[model samples]
Target: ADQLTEEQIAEFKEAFSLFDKDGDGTITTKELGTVMRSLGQNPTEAELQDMINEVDADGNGTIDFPEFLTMMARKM
Candidate 1:
């Protein structure tokens, strides 16, 4: 939260936007699950729900734009 530069912020936003394919301003369980599947981690619906619950900010059952961007920045 305190160390990112403007360029880094822009990069994170771009990455988040790419990941949010549905353009819904939120990242759904399905969106994350699809990425997981690429790494050969196929999760059950319940497990996916748990992941979203654990990681999603705002408690909205979905990862909002900022939430997604923040997580991606940390991950990267």
Candidate 2:
């Protein structure tokens, strides 16, 4: 979370939009889990929830782009 590049930010935004299918600029565990299934990964609801929990700073049970960006920055 400490260091992030402009290029990475742009890349993450592009990726974030893919999961934001409703165009509401937010992501849910269901949305993310569905996408993962598309990639042949069948993640359980609890598994997805754990993923969301890592990034959901406010405990909203969802991930907006800003939260997602921070999560990605930390991971990268």
- Could you give candidate 2's per-residue lDDT for residues 1-76 as a string of tens digits? 3345667677676777777878886788988796557558788888788888877999989888888767766774
Each prediction's Cα lDDT score? 0.69, 0.77
**Candidate 1: lDDT of 7?**
84
Kindly report which residue stretches of model 1 are placed more than 4 angstroms away from their true locations once superposed.
35-47, 69-76
- Tens digit per residue, CA lDDT, model 1, 1-76: 4437878777666766665777877777887676456447787887668777777777879877667655655665
TM-scores, each model vs. reference: 0.61, 0.75
Number of the top-ranking candidate, with TM-score as the measure: 2
The candidate scoring highest on lDDT is 2
